[PDB]
């Protein structure tokens, strides 16, 4: 099994900061087999970079990737607030296919009015709307949890 | 163009079985290798099955061999995952994915996911002896507990929204 290790596990940054996420592989692979994905909270993963350095369609030019052998990296030249996400690397060299544990990129002081007031109205709006799919995901998890709690009780009532 | 829509998820007992489906559209289905990848409650991504474009080759990780089966129906542009001998480790969001190139195995499109919950029935061992009155009482007590957990989440997100709203209003 090819083990995939990401650093950091979590980080908090401000819009404007450079971001580097590293991926370390337990044996050498070709640069054609190392890919990156992003996942906005409340959404499914999406391909970000393929074959180490190629941007997937719709990915803006602030993203880049490099590396070879066992050491790979993803770089965001200048973070934007919309880049808050979890990022995953993946090897496609051999079975079993494996992913890194993920790197969660959060906003530094993201709920601070003093920081937020300098943002554009467009960017504040995007951030506001990014919260609703997160909330909905958490609510659906609670509903599923309670569906499972109901089940053995319903079965016992039905069994009389 | 490319659309992938999963269905068939839900509650299932340990040892039971489930069949997941993925309806694919906006591309030539039979020209692409397809996979299932799951996301655990701890948010780790775990590959569970791949099937080649023509259906001749199928691959699985060790933890799933002899338990799951991946297949595809060329006529209906549909991918399936037959899940059996279910364990608690299988509780996850299951995604259908397409691989663009067989020479790199990058997953270029993902569906919205369908949720599978392996639900333990062990409480039945004592609940089966209770009266119907007392079972319904327990069932009734679950609703305000759920409503309270949901309201707490709504309040947490209101707290997150308000500074953004104030920043907008200061413009």
Q: What are phi and psi of B5, to 5 degrees?
A: -130, 110
Range of the domain at B69: 1-120
Rounded to an integer, what distance in angstroms lies between the CA atom of residue B37 and that of residue B46? Answer: 6
CB B74 within 8 A of CB B21: no
Q: What is the total count of domains within chain B?
A: 2
Residues of chain A in contact with residue B168, where contact means CB-CB under 8 angstroms, are 121, 124-125, 128
Is A129 touching B (CB cutoff 8 A)?
no
- Per the document, the length of chain B is 171
Q: What are phi and psi of B34, to 5 degrees?
A: -125, 150
Asked whether residue B103 falls in the same domain as residue B147, the answer is no
CB A9 within 8 A of CB A62: no
Render the burial of B53-73: b for 16+ CB within 10 Å, e for the rest: beeeeebbbeebeebbbbebe
Strand order in the sheet with A19-29: A4-7, A19-29, A63-76
CB B170 within 8 A of CB A124: no
Rounded to an integer, what distance in angstroms lies between the CA atom of residue B135 and that of residue B120? Answer: 17
Of B102, B120, B138, at which residue does a domain stop?
B120
Rounded to an integer, what distance in angstroms lies between the CA atom of residue B50 and that of residue B99? Answer: 9
Asked whether residue B5 falls in the same domain as residue B40, the answer is yes
Is A61 touching B (CB cutoff 8 A)?
no
Asked whether residue B103 falls in the same domain as residue B140, the answer is no
Q: Which one of B163, B165, B170 makes the best mutation probe of the A interface by having the most chain A beta carbons within 10 Å?
A: B163
Residues of chain A in contact with residue B154, where contact means CB-CB under 8 angstroms, are 135
Asked whether residue B91 falls in the same domain as residue B56, the answer is yes
Rounded to an integer, what distance in angstroms lies between the CA atom of residue A129 and that of residue A123? Answer: 10
Asked whether residue B112 falls in the same domain as residue B130, the answer is no
Tokens representing B58?
A: 């199928």
Tell me the CA distances in angstroms from A36 to A23, B44, B77, B115, one per residue in order: 10, 14, 27, 24
- Per the document, the length of chain A is 160
SS3 label, residue B71 = strand
Asked whether residue B146 falls in the same domain as residue B74, the answer is no
Rounded to an integer, what distance in angstroms lies between the CA atom of residue B34 and that of residue B50? Answer: 6
Tell me, in Å, the resolution of the deposited structure.
2.0
Asked whether residue B37 falls in the same domain as residue B50, the answer is yes
Tokens representing A85?
A: 């996400």
Helix axes B132-169, A121-158, angle to 10 degrees: 180
Rounded to an integer, what distance in angstroms lies between the CA atom of residue B20 and that of residue A120? Answer: 44
Residues of chain B in contact with residue A117, where contact means CB-CB under 8 angstroms, are 167, 170
Q: How many A-B residue pairs are in contact by the CB < 8 A criterion? A: 147
The CATH number of whichever domain residue B145 belongs to comes to 4.10.170.10
Cis ω before A96 (30° cut-off from 0): yes
User: Is B127 in contact with A156 (Cβ distance < 8 A)?
Assistant: yes
CB A2 within 8 A of CB A98: yes
Asked whether residue B24 falls in the same domain as residue B55, the answer is yes
Asked whether residue B51 falls in the same domain as residue B63, the answer is yes
Least Cα separation, residue B63 to chain A (angstroms): 10
Rounded to an integer, what distance in angstroms lies between the CA atom of residue A2 and that of residue A99? Answer: 9
- Would you list the DSSP string of B113-129? -EEEEE---TTHHHHTT
Asked whether residue B160 falls in the same domain as residue B149, the answer is yes
Rounded to an integer, what distance in angstroms lies between the CA atom of residue B120 and that of residue A123? Answer: 44
Of B120, B145, B160, at which residue does a domain stop?
B120
Asked whether residue B98 falls in the same domain as residue B141, the answer is no
Rounded to an integer, what distance in angstroms lies between the CA atom of residue A43 and that of residue A50? Answer: 20
- CB nearest to B130's CB, from A111, A148, A156: A156
Residues of chain A in contact with residue B135, where contact means CB-CB under 8 angstroms, are 153, 156-157
Asked whether residue B126 falls in the same domain as residue B154, the answer is yes
Residues of chain B in contact with residue A125, where contact means CB-CB under 8 angstroms, are 168
- DSSP secondary structure code for residue A31 in this structure: G
């Amino acid at each position: 099994q090819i083990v995939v290790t990401q650093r950091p596990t979590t980080m908090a940054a401000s819009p404007g900061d450079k971001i580097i996420i590293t991926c370390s592989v337990s044996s050498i692979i070709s640069s054609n087999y190392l890919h990156w994905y992003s996942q906005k909270p409340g959404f499914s993963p999406k391909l970000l970079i393929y074959r180490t350095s190629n941007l997937a369609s719709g990915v803006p030019p602030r993203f880049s990737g490099s590396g070879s052998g066992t050491s790979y990296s993803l770089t965001i030249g200048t973070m934007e607030a919309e880049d808050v996400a979890t990022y995953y690397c993946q090897q496609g060299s051999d079975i079993p296919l494996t992913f890194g544990d993920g790197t969660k990129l959060d906003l530094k002081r993201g709920s601070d009015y003093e920081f937020l007031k300098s943002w554009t109205v467009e960017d504040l709006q995007k951030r506001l709307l990014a919260l609703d799919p997160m909330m909905e995901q958490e609510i659906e998890e609670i509903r599923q949890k309670y569906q499972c709690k109901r089940q053995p009780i319903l079965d016992a009532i039905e069994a009389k | 163009d490319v659309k992938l829509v999963e269905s068939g998820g839900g509650l299932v007992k340990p040892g039971g079985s489930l069949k997941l489906s993925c309806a694919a559209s906006g591309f030539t289905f039979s020209s692409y290798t397809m996979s299932w990848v799951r996301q655990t409650p701890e948010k780790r991504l775990e590959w569970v099955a791949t099937i080649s474009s023509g259906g001749s080759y199928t691959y699985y990780p060790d933890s799933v061999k002899g338990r799951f089966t991946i297949s595809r129906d060329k006529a209906k542009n549909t991918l399936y995952l037959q899940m059996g001998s279910l364990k608690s480790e299988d509780t996850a969001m299951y995604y259908c994915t397409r691989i663009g190139y067989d020479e790199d195995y990058a997953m270029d499109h993902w569906g919205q996911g369908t949720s599978v919950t392996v639900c333990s029935g062990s409480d039945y061992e004592f609940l089966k002896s209770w009266t119907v009155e007392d079972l319904q009482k327990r069932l009734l007590a679950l609703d305000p507990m759920m409503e309270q957990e949901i309201e707490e989440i709504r309040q947490k997100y209101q707290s997150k929204r308000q500074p953004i709203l104030d920043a907008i209003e200061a413009k």
